[PDB]
Structure 1
Amino acid sequence: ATKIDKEACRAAYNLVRDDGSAVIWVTFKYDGSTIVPGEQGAEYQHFIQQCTDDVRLFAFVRFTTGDAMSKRSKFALITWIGENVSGLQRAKTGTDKTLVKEVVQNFAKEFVISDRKELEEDFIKSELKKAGGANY
């Protein structure tokens, strides 16, 4: 019976999109059975710390790559699933992403990760490089 606070998760989503905002990541978490905004920041390293072993969550992160005239904004939708989270949870969570993709309309790529080493900034960017264009 998972649902989501669209009206609220959309504000966060838009906050990471808007360039002049400084916010580069917003999390979406389970607040019972209703998915809602978690934390957000300007520092990517602070996001990795939201991804503990007993939590599962969703994220929308703006990655900047290249430089000068080659600068491009790579958005990524991420589903962090704690290694120490239930078994039904992991699968039930993969179900709810559908519900999350209703607000989080476009992203160059999506991830289902449970090993922080995968959130390593330069590795995740490498991965966004091998991807391509948005997702409507």
Structure 2
Amino acid sequence: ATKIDKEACRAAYNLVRDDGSAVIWVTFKYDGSTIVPGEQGAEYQHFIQQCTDDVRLFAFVRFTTGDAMSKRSKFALITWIGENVSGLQRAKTGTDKTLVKEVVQNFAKEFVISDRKELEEDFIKSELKK
């Protein structure tokens, strides 16, 4: 019965893939049985603040590496599941990720994270490197 507002979520997705946009991260959260857009932001540290132990969420984030003429972007699909989320909802999130991917079609790598330490900007970058 999980549903998704494709239109709304696709707009958030595209907002991030747009270079002429200041928004580098957007989230997708459950509003009852429907996945809808959650918060968005231009500063990555504010994304980490949305990832608490009590919640779960999907996120599409633009990371930037290089500089000047070598500056380039790499997008990541991140599924965040707080340690307090139940085992059953934890499993459900894994299944529903398929629905999210119907919108988040392009990304360099996808992650399933429960430890904020693994959200540290430099860690994610080293991962995207691989």
Structure 1's unaligned 5+ residue stretches are 131-136
Q: Map of 1:5-84 to 2, 5 A cutoff?
A: 5-84=5-84
CA positional deviation for 1:72? 1.3
Q: Deviations over 1:67-91 (max 9, x none)?
A: 1222110000000001001110111
Deviations 1:56-108 (A, max 9, x none): 00000000011122211000000000100111011110000000000011000
Distance 2:72 2:7 in 1: 28
**SS of equivalent to 2:90:** helix
Q: Deviations over 1:6-49 (max 9, x none)?
A: 01100100100111110000000000010000000000000000
Aligned CA-pair RMSD: 0.6
Displacement of 1:3 in angstroms is 1.0
Cα drift, residue 118 of structure 1: 0.1
Tell me the residue number matched to 1:133. none
Distance 2:81 2:73 in 1: 25
Instruction: Supply the distance in 2 between the matched residues of 1:69 and 1:16 (Cα, whole angstroms).
Output: 21
Note the residue ranges of structure 2 that are not aligned, 5 or more in a row: none
Structure 1 runs of 4+ off > 6 angstroms? none
SS in 1 for 2:80: strand
> So what's the TM-score if we normalise by structure 1?
0.94
Q: Distance in 1 between matches of 2:82 and 2:89?
A: 10
Report the 3-state secondary structure (helix = DSSP H, G, I; strand = E; otherwise coil) of the residue aligned with 2:110: strand
For the residues of structure 2 that align with 1:24 and 1:100, how far apart are their CA atoms? 18
In the aligned structure 2, how far is the partner of 1:87 from the partner of 1:101?
A: 22
Give CA-to-partner distance per residue, 1:101-127, whole Å, 9 cap, x none: 000110000000000000000000110
Aligned residues: 130
